[PDB]
Amino acid sequence: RVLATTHYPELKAYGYNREGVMNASVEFDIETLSPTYKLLIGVPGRSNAFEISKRLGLPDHIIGQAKSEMTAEHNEVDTMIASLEQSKKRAEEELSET
Amino acid sequence: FEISKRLGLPDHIIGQAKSEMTAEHNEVDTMIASLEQSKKRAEEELSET
């Protein structure tokens, strides 16, 4: 029985390529810049470095240049996780009203 | 790898790890399939809610 932790964009994908392996993450709230400590089984962890940097005042031209040094696949993955996570947030908020 | 080998890490793990440096992007497409499926489920659950 194995539980492992990583911050590497390789291992973001590790478990989906494997039988009997789960990929998970622990949720972060960028709007408070605080961890929610909530374990998301099945959902892998997006990186938010630029969004945190913007919320801390880093200039948009530096973020725009750094995002141009990234691969096309990197920018898709963290955006897809953000769209999933926002859809989950919407489901949770609309459920709390319900 | 040279440090890990010297500390006693087995040669088959080091051999395999030099291929784990290329065990990439096909994993990410398989991850993306799980991302889109998880998004689709969250939208179905929202529609039910």
Curated annotation (Swiss-Prot), chain B:
Observed effect of gene inactivation: Not essential, it can be deleted. No change in spontaneous mutation rate; does not genetically interact with mutS or mutL. About 10-fold increased sensitivity to mitomycin C (MMC). Decreased transformation efficiency of both chromosomal (5-fold decrease) and plasmid DNA; a double mutS2-recU deletion strain has a 57-fold decrease in chromosomal DNA transformation efficicency. Hypersensitive to antibiotics that target the ribosome; erythromycin, chloramphencicol and tetracycline, but not to beta-lactam antibiotics.
Reported induction: Constitutively transcribed in rich and minimal media, highest transcripts occur in stationary phase in minimal media. In rich medium protein is expressed at a constant level during all growth stages (at protein level). Probably part of the polX-mutS2-yshE operon.
Bilayer-spanning residue ranges: none
Compartments in which it is found: Cytoplasm
Domain of life: Bacteria
Subunit structure: Binds to ribosomes as a homodimer. Binds to stalled/collided disomes, association is greater in (ribosome-targeted) antibiotic-treated cells (with increased stalling at specific mRNA sites). The clamp domain of one monomer binds the A-site finger, the 23S rRNA of the central protuberance and ribosomal protein uL5 of the leading (stalled) ribosome, while the other monomer binds in a gap between the ribosomal central protuberance and the L1 stalk of the leading ribosome.
Comment text on domains: The KOW and Smr domain are required for mitomycin C resistance. The ATPase and clamp domain (approximately residues 1-586) form a tweezer that holds the lead (stalled) ribosome. The long coiled-coil domain binds along the disome interface, coordinated by interactions with helix 39 of the 16S rRNA of both ribosomes. Deletion of the Smr domain (residues 702-785), which might have nuclease activity, has litle impact on ribosome rescue in vitro, but the strain is less competitive against wild-type in vivo.
Miscellaneous notes: The ssrA gene (for tmRNA) encodes the SsrA tag added to nascent proteins in stalled ribosomes by trans-translation, which targets the nascent protein for degradation.
Function: Acts as a ribosome collision sensor splitting the ribosome into its 2 subunits. Detects stalled/collided disomes (pairs of ribosomes where the leading ribosome is stalled and a second ribosome has collided with it) which it binds and splits, by an ATP-hydrolysis driven conformational change. Does not seem to have endoribonuclease activity (in the context of ribosome stalling). Does not seem to be involved in mismatch repair or in the prevention of interspecific recombination during DNA transformation. Might be involved in homologous recombination. Putative endonuclease that may be involved in the suppression of homologous recombination and may therefore have a key role in the control of bacterial genetic diversity.
UniProt family annotation: Belongs to the DNA mismatch repair MutS family. MutS2 subfamily.
Name of the molecule in the record: Putative endonuclease MutS2
Source organism (scientific name): Bacillus subtilis (strain 168)
